[PDB]
Every structure is written in C-alpha cells, then in structure tokens.
Write a protein that binds this ligand. Sequence first.
Ligand SMILES: [K+]
Ligand SMILES: [K+]
Ligand SMILES: [K+]
Ligand SMILES: [K+]
Ligand SMILES: [K+]
Ligand SMILES: [K+]
Lengths: 321, 320, 320, 321, 320, 321
Amino acid sequence: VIIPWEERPAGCKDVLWRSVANPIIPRDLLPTSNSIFNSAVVPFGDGFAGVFRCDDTSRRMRLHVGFSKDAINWNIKEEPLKFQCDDEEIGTWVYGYDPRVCFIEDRYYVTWCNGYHGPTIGVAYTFDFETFHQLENAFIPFNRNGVLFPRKINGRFAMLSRPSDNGHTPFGDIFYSESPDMEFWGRHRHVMSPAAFEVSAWQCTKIGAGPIPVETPEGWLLIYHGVLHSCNGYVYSFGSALLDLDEPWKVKFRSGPYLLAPREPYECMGDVPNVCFPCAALHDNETGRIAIYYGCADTVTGLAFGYIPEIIEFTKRTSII
Amino acid sequence: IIPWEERPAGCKDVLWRSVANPIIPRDLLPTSNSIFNSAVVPFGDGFAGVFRCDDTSRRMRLHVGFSKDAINWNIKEEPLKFQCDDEEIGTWVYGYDPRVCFIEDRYYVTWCNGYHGPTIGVAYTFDFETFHQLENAFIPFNRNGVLFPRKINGRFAMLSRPSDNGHTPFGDIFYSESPDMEFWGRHRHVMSPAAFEVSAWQCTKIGAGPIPVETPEGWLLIYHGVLHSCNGYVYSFGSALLDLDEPWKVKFRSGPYLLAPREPYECMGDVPNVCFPCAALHDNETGRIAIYYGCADTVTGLAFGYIPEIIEFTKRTSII
Amino acid sequence: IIPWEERPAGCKDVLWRSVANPIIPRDLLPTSNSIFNSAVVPFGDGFAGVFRCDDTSRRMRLHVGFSKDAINWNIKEEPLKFQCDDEEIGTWVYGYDPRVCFIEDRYYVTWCNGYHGPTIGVAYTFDFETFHQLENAFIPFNRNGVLFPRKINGRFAMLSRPSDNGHTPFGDIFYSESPDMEFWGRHRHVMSPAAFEVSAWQCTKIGAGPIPVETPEGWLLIYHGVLHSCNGYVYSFGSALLDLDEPWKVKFRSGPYLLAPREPYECMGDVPNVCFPCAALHDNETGRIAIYYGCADTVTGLAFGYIPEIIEFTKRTSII
Amino acid sequence: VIIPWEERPAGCKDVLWRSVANPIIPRDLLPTSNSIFNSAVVPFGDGFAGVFRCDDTSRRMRLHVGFSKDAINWNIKEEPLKFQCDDEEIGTWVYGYDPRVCFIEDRYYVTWCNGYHGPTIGVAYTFDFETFHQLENAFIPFNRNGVLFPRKINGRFAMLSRPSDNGHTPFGDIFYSESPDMEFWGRHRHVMSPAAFEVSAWQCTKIGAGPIPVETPEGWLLIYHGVLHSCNGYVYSFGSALLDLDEPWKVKFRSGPYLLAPREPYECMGDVPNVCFPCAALHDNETGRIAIYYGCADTVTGLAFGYIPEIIEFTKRTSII
Amino acid sequence: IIPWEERPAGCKDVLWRSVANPIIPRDLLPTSNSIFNSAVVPFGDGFAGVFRCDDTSRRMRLHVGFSKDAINWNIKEEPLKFQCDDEEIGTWVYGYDPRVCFIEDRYYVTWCNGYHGPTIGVAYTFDFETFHQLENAFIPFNRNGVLFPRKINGRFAMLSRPSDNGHTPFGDIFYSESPDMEFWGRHRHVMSPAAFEVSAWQCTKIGAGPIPVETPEGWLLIYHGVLHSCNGYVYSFGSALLDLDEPWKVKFRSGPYLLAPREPYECMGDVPNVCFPCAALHDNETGRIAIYYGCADTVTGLAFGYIPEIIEFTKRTSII
Amino acid sequence: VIIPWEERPAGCKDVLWRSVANPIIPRDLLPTSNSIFNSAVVPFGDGFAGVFRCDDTSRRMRLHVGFSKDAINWNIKEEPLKFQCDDEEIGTWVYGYDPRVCFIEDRYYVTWCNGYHGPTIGVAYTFDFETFHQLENAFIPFNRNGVLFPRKINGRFAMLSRPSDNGHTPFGDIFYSESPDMEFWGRHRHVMSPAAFEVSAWQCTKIGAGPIPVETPEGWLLIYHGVLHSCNGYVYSFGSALLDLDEPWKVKFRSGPYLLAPREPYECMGDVPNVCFPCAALHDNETGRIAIYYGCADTVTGLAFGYIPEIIEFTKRTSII
Ligand SMILES: [K+]
Ligand SMILES: [K+]
Ligand SMILES: [K+]
Ligand SMILES: [K+]
Ligand SMILES: [K+]
Ligand SMILES: [K+]
C-alpha cells in the first residue's frame, strides 16, 4: 500500500499541510453531482476504494462507490449505491450522508448518517465494494458522526457517535459504544464535550469524530471537527486527541489549537462557506505518514498531509486536558 | 386487590377520576415540593413503588414507597440510592420519570437518568430495599423508557422517546430489544405525534406512560400527548393497541383523549395543565384498571376504567 | 329582548360581568372539550348562533345553536357542514373564530378557515340549517375577520387581521371592501398595537371581536389586545370608534381596557388568562349592549354596559 | 424583437448556461448605487425597457426605470421612479423592491413589493415608461413575489403571489389569484409548496415566482426560486414548473433538480452570499430561445440562456409531481 | 412595632405566610389593575412605602402609601412625580421594581426606570411627599437595584442585576459602590444562578429583594430565583449571607427556597407562579422579620420568620 | 508625526478610499495568529505604537502590542500583553477583544472588551507600551465598544460605550458616560440608536463606536459601525457623525449613506464574512488628512483615507437628522 504524499513545503512549520493539488475531487465530477465532499477512503486490492457523499442537482444526499489507483484521482460511480437488506423496514432509503469506511477482521464496514425517522447511524458490510449488506441501524435517532474502530476492543466492536437533534444541531458531545455482534449496542460512555469558548473556541459549540481512529503506541489518534459560532454562522475546523488504548472513552490529550481551519477560497466559498470537515485518512506506520481527507465548504474534497509523531507531540504539547 | 371506584351514575366517560384525588399530596415528606410520578406494582402482601419526589431545592429524586391499599402511601424520606460496580455509571446527577415492572424473576426500574444529558437508567430489585444499577440502555437524549412486562420472542423490550437537551418540542415513541438488559438494538419506530387537524392533544410530542398491558387483542398502551398553545403545553393522555408479537406495529390509536386537565389540581401547580400517566394496576378477571397520573407536576392522581371499554373506544375512535 | 343585568350599585365599571358566568359550560355536548366562541344574532322568535366547539380530539369545529333568551343555548351535537359548488374551497380542514351578522337579505358567517394555512372563510344562510360557502376572502395568513352589518358606500366591508402560520407575535387590524362577496380590495390599515409604555394590554397584537356597532357618531369596535408576559399572553379587550364613512379612520381608541382576565373561569383552563370578545347584542332604544366573550379558551361568558357610556369612556381615555 | 443570445458552449450538457459577460449590470452603475440585482425587463419600442431594483449607499430600496438597445447594456435613470396616484394614502412611498413588468392587452403593468404597513404587492401601469399610474395594492400584507400573467385567464387578470411575514420569512407557498378589474382580487388558489427536503432540498424552505409566466402549448412555464436552509444561512437556486393553461394553480410538472444555483464568485460573494434570484425573461417562440435575468448575491445582475423545448423536456423528465 | 403573627403550632417551616394574605388587593385604587411591589420603611409614628401599581392601561407606575400598622395601606391615587433639574434624566417613560431605605439622613428610592431601556433610577426624600431624582446609577440594561442601609467603608453600595431589553433569560447579582450617589464603580460579581442539578428554583436567574439586613454574621440577603418550566417561569425566594466588609463575597447560600408559589393568590393572576420579595421590616431585639412579596404580579402578600432561624437554615443548607 | 497617506485615485468621487496595499496586516503575521483585525494605533516616540486584537490558532482572543515606523508595516509582539493589577479579582484574565488606545494628558489609556462575568469595558494605562497598569472595569456587564475621548470634557474623563448582551447581540445604542478619576463612572447619556430600516438600513440593527473621537471646530467626528441584518447574517459598514463639543451625547449631524461597506474579497471572505469594522484613526489637522484602520472580515486589517473637511461636509449634507 503506497499512500499519497507530498513533502512539507520548505519553511512551513505547520503540523499539517494542504495538497497543492486541492481540491482533489471537483463538485461536478458526475453528470448530476452538485457537490462531493465526504470521501470515506480505504486501501482495496492493488489500489483504493471508497464511499463518497455526492449531493446531486436536486440537493439529495446519496452515497456512491469510487475506485482509484493513487487515492488522489477518483472514478466514482454515477449511480448511487443501493444497500441490500433482509428487513424491509430498515432497508427503506430516505437519505444518507457522513459515510465512514473501515476494514475489521474479515470485511469492510460502512457506516453513514441514515434517515430512519430522523438521523441515525446506518451500518453495512461489503467484501467487494459492489454488493453491500445492510445491518441494523446501531442507535435510535438522533445521532451521527458514527465512526468504528478498526479492530475489536476487548472482544467487541466499538463505535464513536455524536448525539444530535432533528435540525442544525447547536450542541454535540462525542460518545463511545460497544457491540458483541454489530446488532446490539451498549456500554455507552462519554468521550468528550465541546471546550469552553475561552479555552479553545474552534471546538466550543459542538464536536464530532472524523477519520477512523488510528492506533499509535501513545493512544488512539482521533482527528475530529469542532464548530465555532460567529454572528454569521458556523466555522468548522479540525484538530486531534489521544484516547486510551483499552478504554477509548478516556481522553488523555486534546489539542488546544486546530490542525486545520478554513483559509483557502475552496474552503471559504461554496455551498456551506467556512467548512473543513475531516472524513478519512490513510497512514503508514513505517514512515509515520498520514493523509487526511476533508470536505471543503461542503462543495469539494481536499487532502492534507502530516506526520503521526508530529501530530502526537502537538497534541500533547498543547493539550487542554 | 387493586383500588377501585364504580363509575358515577349517568357518567358515560371511559375513565373517571377518583373522588379522593389527589391521592398523594405535594408535602408528604418533610422536604418535598412535589410528588407526581408513582411507579407502582403489587409487592408481597400489598404494594410498592418508586416515586419522583422533587425537593424544596427543586432537585429531582426517586424515593421508595409502600402501601397496603395502593391509595395511601408511606414514602421513605431518604432518596433511593443505587448500587453499581461501575463508578462511572453509578454516579448520580439526577433522576425522574420512573417506571417499575416485574419481569420473570425480579422487579426492574427504569428512569430518566442524567448521564451527560437525559437517558434511560436501568436497575433491578428483589425487595425494594437494595437496587442494583445496570447500564444505561441508550445514549442521550432519551426518556419515557417503559419496559414490557415479559420478553418478546426471547428478548427484553422497551419503549423509549428520543428527545433533546431542553424542553423537547418533538417526540416519537420508539421500540427496542435486548437479550441481556445490557446491549440494545433492533430499534423500531412505533408512532409519531398526530397532525394537529386530526388530533391536536397529541400533535407536538407523545411518550409512553404505564407499563404495557397485555390483552388478547394486543398490548394496551396508555400514553401522553402534548398540545402547544400560545401559553404553553397541555398534557393529556389516551390509548393505543399494539401488535402482540411486533409491538412497534400500532393496530389502533385513539382520536380523542381519555383524560385531560380539568380539575384545579390538574390545572394549577408547578406546571399547569398536566395529566401525565405513569403507572397502572389491573385485574384481568374483572377488566378493572386503575391508572396513576401526575397532576400539574405537583400531586398524584388516580383514575379508573374497564379494559374492554378502553379497547372498544380505542378501536371505534381509531385514527389508524 | 336582549339579555341584560343591572349594574351592581356602587360599581363604577363601564362593563360588568354577568353573575351567571359562565353562560356556556365546556362539556355541554357529549364530545365537547371547550366552547368559547359564540357568534350570536337575533333570529325568528329568538336567537341563533355559530359556536366554536373544540372536541375531545381537540379538533376545531363549528356548531349551530338556538336559544329563546340568548343565555341558555341548545347547540347541535353534530358540527355544521357547508355546502360549496367548488370542491377545492369546500374541503374542510379546520374552522374557528366564527362571526355572524345579517346583511340586507341573509345572514353571513365568517370564520378562520384552513386553506393551506389560516384564512377567512365566508358563507351565508337564510335559516341556520343550510350554509352556502363562498370564496375565502383573502390569501392566508389571516384571521379575526369581521363583516360590517351593512354595505359601506355600496360595498361589503370586512375587518381582518394579517397573521402567520403559528401563534402570531404581531397583528394589525385592516379593512377591506368587495362589491360582490367574492373579489376584495381597497385594503386600508385600521390600527396597530399600542406602544407598551402607553397601553400594554394591546401592545403585542390586536384583533376585532364583535360585529361593529353603528352609532350616530361612528362605528363602535370592541377588539382584543395582547400583552406578552414572561409566562405567555394575556388577552384583554377594549373599545374604539371608527369613522362612519371611512371606517379605517380611527377617531378614538381606549387607553384602558374594558375587561381583562380576573375571575377563575378567565384565569384557569385550556389557555389561561384569556377574555376574547366574539359577539354582541344591542338595543339602540335603551342603549344596552351585551357582549359575549371566550374565557380561558374553555367557556363562554357575558358582560353588560351602555353604548353611550362606552363611547364616553373611549373618547375620554383616547390614546389617539 | 431581437433577444440577447449566446450558444450553448462546446460539450456543455446543461439546460441553462451563464452569459460569459456576467455580470451584465454592475453594482455601481449609478452614482449612489450599492447594488442592482432585479431587472424587470420587456421589449419596448425598438429596444427594451425595464424597472430595476437599485439599493443605494444608504441601503434604501428604490425602483428606477431603464432603457437599452440590446437588453444587455443598460441606461438606468439616476432618479428613482415616482408613481402617480390618485389616493394619497396608497400613493405614500415607504420602500420598494421585487419589481416585475409585463404587457397585458394594451399596456405595461408593474408589480413590486410595496411597503404598506408591511410588505404587500403594489400595482401600476404605464404606456411609455415615463408616467406610471399607481393602482390599489393587490393584497393585504404580508405578501411578495407578485407576478402577473401576460394575458387574461377566463376573462380575468391573474397574479401569482407568495404569502410571507414581517421578516426574513422562513416559509412560503406560491398562490394564484384573479381580478376582473385590477382593483378587487379573489378566487385564491394554492399553486405549490416547498418540496420535502428528502425529495428536492434546493426548494424545501420556501419558493417564489420569478419571471413572468411564459405560455407554451405544454402549459405555463414558470421559472421560480427555491430556498435551502444550511447551518450558515439560505442558498437561493432556481428551477422550472409547468402550470395548466386554463387553471394555472394546477401544476403539471415540477423539476426535481434546479436549473441554476450559486456557483460563480459573483453569485457566492456579495451583500447576500449564495443567491441566484430570477426576475425576468425575454423569449422568442420561433427559435425557442429564452434569456433569463437573475440577481447575483443581491449585488449584481446576471443573464443565463436556454431553449424553451429543452427546459420543458427537462421539467417533465425530472418531475416530482 | 413590626407586623407579626406567630408560627402555627405544628409547622417546621422557616417562614409562614400571614393568614390575612393578600394584605393589599389588586383593586385598591380606582384605576389599579395590580399592586405587587411594596417598598416599605418605618416613617414618623408609622410606615411609608413606594408601591408599584400597574393601572388599567397596564402602565407601570409608582405611588406613595402610608400605614400605621404596615398591613393596611392608604396609597395615594396620583402616581408619584420625581423632581429633577435635568430634563433629560427627569423624563418619565415607566417605573417599576421600587426599593426604599434610610441612609444616614434621608430615605433613598431606587426603581427600574426607563431610560432607553431598563436601568436603576435613584431619588431621595425627607418626608415622602417630595422626591428629588438623582442620576440613574448605571447604563441599561439593569434592574433589581437594592441599596445597603449604611455606607460600606465610606461609600454608598448597591446590589444590581444586569439584564437585557426583554424578559431576560439570565441574571447574576452584582455589587457596586459610589462616594456620592452619582458616580458608581468597583463593580464586583456577587453570585450567579445555581446549576439546575444543585438548586433548580434559582438556576435561570436571580435578583436581590429586600434591603440587605445587617446581622453579626453578615448581611442577610433575601433574593428571588427563577426556574424555567415548559410552561414558563416560576419565581421562588431564598436567603444568603454576605460578608459584612466586602459584601460581594457570599459566605452561605440556601439550597432550598424559603417560599415558592403555593396558594391560589400566588399561582393564579396576571403572571402565574410568582413570589417576588420586595421589602422587609425587622426587629433585632426579638429577631422578628416581616417579608413583603408580590404574588402572581397581582397582589401583595406578607410572610414572617425569625432572623436567627433563617441564618441557621442558610448555613445548614448552604451550597456553597 | 508623518501619518500614512495615499492620494485620492483619479476619478474617484468617494469620501474615503481604500489603500492600494490592503490588507496592511495579514492574518498569519505571528507564529500562532489565526486573524489580526483590530489595530488600536497611536503616535508614539519617533513612530507609532498599538494594541492589536490577534486571535490565535486556539481561537482565543488576546491583545498584543505592536510598533511601526510608518504605521503601515507593523512589528507585533509574539507574546500577548499582560496587565499588571493590584486587585486579583479584576486582574484575572478571561479574554479580551475590541481594543482602543488614546493619549489623555500624560499617559496612554487602553480600553478593551474584557471578560468579567461577561463582556464589560476594561481600562488600563501605559507610559511606554511595555508595562500596562490595569484599572477598574468601567462598567457592569454587558457592554463593549468602549472608546475614550482624547481629552477631558468639563473636567472629566469621558467614554462612549454600547450596552449589549451575553451573545451576538441583536441590538445596540451608543451611550456616553463620565468619570472624575477613571474609577467611578456616571452621568450616563444616550447618544444614538440604530436608524429606521427605511431610512438608513446599513445602520438599522445596531451601531457601535469605532476610532477615538476626533475633535474638530464643528463637533467631535465620530466614525462608527452599523449593522444590517440580511437572511444570511450581519453586514458591518461604517459612517460618520458629528457630536456637540461640550455635550457629546448630543448628535448634531449623522450621515445617511455609509462611508465604507464590504466590497473587496478581503472584506467579504474570511472568518466572519462582510465586515468592515473601524477601530482607529491617525489624523493631521494641518492638512486635514485622516487614515482610518479597520478590520476586514474579522481576518485582516485594512486602511482607508479621507480628508476631515470632506467628511464633515458629507456628514452634514447627507444628515438624517
Ligand atoms: K471521557
Ligand atoms: K409503527
Ligand atoms: K387608520
Ligand atoms: K396547486
Ligand atoms: K462573589
Ligand atoms: K443623544
């Protein structure tokens, strides 16, 4: 697996740096796409695969499969994916957004914000990114920013989530839950809350999980978004925390500064201005390299690069825990 | 021997209020401000319950109570304290909205438990002296958690009511199952508030009340509904019938309310215009049912009816 | 022979409540939850009315009533249906806020009629048994439609109250005309809520109540006003005098109210703290006026006064 | 009558395409103009005339007359338009915006959102775009987006409107009404409501009529805006519907996708970000060509081009009715 | 000789309502709609006060009252007019929330005075006949202004409550000093609403009531607290002890309330569920204190207690 | 003192013109700066000094001292400034923004929006822009936009303020207060309220003082911001008023039009879009030159130039009183 990479520019001191090829996925890649801004990406085969949020010209929210040789240039299917489901009630499509994908043990799991009398977390698996078998929704509405851990945590599946409401939710804590079987969920634990505005305002309104947690010797590296409320709306930035390995609802370090915030025209102008919303990462433990995918202005998808050891140090050095 | 009063003569109402309401006064304890949830079950030679008693600090606490007749209560002055092996879950913040039922071999208690916002707490007891707390069933925000009094195809089942962090302006009843009273899933929507032009007493939000009452025709669900006036919410309650095997499937749902705020003790107090049903005792032999409900979030009331009359009213006036 | 009761001696109030209030109870009908609009007129050897009767489903429906004395009413159990040649307009969604007056050859009914939101429905009857529905007078959102009881310079005329899709937090009274009871126009603003520092009982929103009463010095308009407290709205009512020929021109408007919620039947009920005037009977010969009003959106009450006194009060306390 | 036209760019598949000379009217055309973003345009004499919303440097909303040879380059009068009115109360000017202009039988009629104890629909006529005779306001407040039909229907004048409130209204259905005399109005009928967000979210908060309805054998072509509410405010897009010829409150087809939505910098940045608000169109039945004027970010005016038969085919094929 | 009624036998309550409540009715004056702030002090061989009397126009005015026994009040019909040499500050817009205390050589009156929004008006009087207006103490928005009854280290001192332009959803008590009753500063935060899970009767906002009472253990502050239900605000009141020398430092603060809306005259009226303390008379030799408070923003009521008992209560139940 | 100046562009008829080198202070000037958008600038020594609002990458609001030879190119201290205070209660730092600086008789005074149980006006002095001595907060919360007068008025210090609330306040009048000693404040007077929307909508939601009042023979020249509320948020523009010399709460003239409104990409895009927030001015009575510093989009700092006599004449001739 060769992950995408660009070397940190000369004299850049930032922990993460934007791809000079951003945006890597344009808003109009498909004949009917309005925007493409969640890219739930993983290695697959001799390349990469992913589940993409592609909102169409009707402003419907759909998920599409994509493939790529280099993880930068994507061939996304024109037709939305369809989930196969034994149960007619759960298998009913209303809408879907916020996908996340990860491989656990023997297959790829997809979670997404699935409408079922409100936003909840849908769950499906695939062996091949062609047929997807839909499982029970993991939780009762309202919930989103569902993000699985990439292995079992002491014998059970684990998921981060984000209790919400039925609108543009003005609050949001990260939570942790477990399941023995991808059907029945429990042992719910609070992970963290928005910071106080006077401490770290980029994350003081609400927060939610981003990429699949990345295992490091110093804890699970969580890349997560945070919201700040100005008089003219919300600004979405993102940052990092380290979670205990065995009890990942225990936050050990949490960054004060953001890692990335809306700065470039493609992040500050578009369907929802001033949004950097991380959705996936690819990483390489040998080199420490990480590549983070993020939606820009809810319009296009970008990539940013960093080193895991540098991120860990930044997280601990600036920690507000 | 559950409490009973015959319908007044000439009264054609399906439910009739006890002539002795309120049956529990606001100031029964030395520091109680209000007492308005009564989660009542038969126990040993008499009755037991878990009661929401808000104190003079306006803190929300649960207290155990006992009664020989189910009308006159001796409520413990100390609040109930749960035992928990897990210190994280075992931390008390607040508690309201209790419900109590016997399932297979023990009594279970659910309540709206504070855990970074309202969720549904779960505990068991054999004796109403020691309570053993289990995992909270769901992530916040959730309340009106009401267990079924037996397993449904080999699993525990619970009605709930996803909510928000404040005075929630919405709310559907949901249904979930668990094999072990720890892990929960198979979530199914039961019902939504009605359109205001169909049935406005239940058009803002709804929530389950007493434990479901099994009948040959399905589960008898007594639930509250809210109407939003310019000067606030009005809580009334009514009746539905749920499928026996798949209780998320609603068979019949009443258009009219069974009861709504009328009397001064319902219409004046800490939260005016509230009738909030929280428990029921019934006898299948005679069809008699006795429904406990909170009045004005201040005091506790009792109402009477017959199960076959309620069922016929529910079908005849059904908006499904 | 309009209803009347003498001024309690050593009462100096412009209006005084009937000692028999409430004159219509909430449960007069077997399925009524509340009865609090009574759009009353003389008819044959007695009186007839269209009443807002909300049922135990909290649906809003209109029912006909009859009475020998205008105090004790026999209201039909079944809601009235309108007859309409146009299927789209004749679709019933909900109805409230009725008003009734005789114009020239027949009685006209207006009400708040649901047609993709609140608007003003219009109908005529000759007999109070069959009602023929005409075009809704305006586009939503509008209510408190009140016809003048004769034409104003060759046209039908109506007061209205532009509103929104909810519990509207604003409301001016407007005036409109129509040559044919179908097409409406020449809209003119009558008045806006007062500044709270001047007259706070009518500072949030106002609306017309009774059919305007012709006096030789202009139209007596009895209208409700709303005050917004931290705990919701308080509805009181008062008086204005409109120019005879151009009734959008307000000549005098009272600073103080005439009546405000005081009694328990006004202060406790489905919507607390509401006195909402809906009709009036009067006798020019004696100057007597009898004013019907909804109490707490639950029951109907009556109040009495003298036209000349009300006019004097209106001029003397005028904020215009 | 030679309407403005540019061909569809090479390989463009879109039903409408933007003028490459956008914006066609700049914000600062008049000495005190702040913004010029409604252009109610008609053929007149040997060229074109129009009534324009020009908000000045005091942010007052005024209407101005303009003229043009080619309908792209405009000479707008510096002085605001004054209406003559026989009734001094109705003739009182508080503010005006949202103009629309059309010729009905023997004269041009102007409607606008006119302040009369709140927004309502004002009405006037002119024969020459010099003297304007003000008629009665058509409706009681609150209402705007008044748009006349360009001929009588069943022997009456007809007008689409849009019941509103006293603010930045968070709802809005399109209504239809008739008048025998341009004075008394009635026979009010509901045309359509915002769509469900799951179905077509660009038009799920509110909608309102745009250009004068365009007669086709297939019904009235209505171009209308719709609003989507994001966390960061409203996004105005526009689309198309076909109304029954004889009973125009009856919608026959209604597009799922939008025709145009904010995409270019001049639509995304300015006084009100993310607005494409259609206001007028010129069309030529012989060729099928249509040119649609629309306000961009409440700052400038743009043009877009299409073919009426293609628009109708799109409206039908993608219909949500 | 302060008013006094002994505690009923068998009552463990720290305060008890007078059995003759309400002591001032809503209709005492010819045009009074409600009378519910009574800023009372000893004066001559009896008592005086400034009273908030809202009229039938719902305008908020202040009127002077006198009483020989402090229970039965003769309140003047004419609103009080302040004399002021500056016409800008002297302009009357509205006035409510009065408080009155003697400091050194005269009586001082504070009130919520409209000056482009609510702020704290200040005046003095020697005789309760002429009132001389001083500068408003603060910029809007502020109210619940309450002076200390002597200087604190050579300065006048005042508690206040920063607010907004509406029915304020927040509110901390602050402390400020002035050398000269014109320029104010050294602002210090006294306290904030409590967390709802700790003491919900005081979790939305709080504000000072009676003039602070000097005790050997600190200043006894009686203050109101607000709880926010789905149906509005509930106003209760409680006690704190402030440091004698630096009175922004709170030493003790009651978890429970001392009094909360319970009787019909507190629960029903213009603003339901309000007990708003506004003044207190006390006798240090016997420990007796008589607390005046508004009831449902309609009438005025009286409650009694013993200062040593209130202190012990405040200490024993302190949440700090 | 040689104040920065650029000559009025040929053809330009505006009363103020933007520097051709805007933004003069970039958002990333400091190693940890997210945005730099208030520049409270004064002559000092052989050049200029200032207190600057620099929000960091944690989105904390801090004040930093800066120095410049020319008042355009600034050397801002990396470390936030710290206030010295004898009282521990008042000396507690929670947050600070909205700085203003002016020399009064013998020292420089700094005001800012200081957190003390909500937003209030902090006050400090400095002789050297190295040590700052904090005084009592001038008012009880909630208040901001505190701006001292640059000399005493009838023997007293004087300050403009702006009573607010605990959020993004949807209202705002300018008030005036006095103090004999920079400790006790009083004699509060209403200066002005927002204008009616039908008169001057750029200033109809709220208003607040900007630069230190500039004394002229015709009154105090107040440059102030005004807010307009669109469906998509607030737009901040600024204009001018003349206050009576002896009783500065008496407004004598107040402009109808604005002087400046968000127009350029650096005013329209950034952390808070569509904001032009004036915070300071340098002026020369001999030449009438004035240079006005202003925050752009709450991101960067810009400069604009004008002539005081032109501004006085514009203010009077366009007066809405
Ligand atoms: K945690
Ligand atoms: K169901
Ligand atoms: K008028
Ligand atoms: K239709
Ligand atoms: K303190
Ligand atoms: K002034």
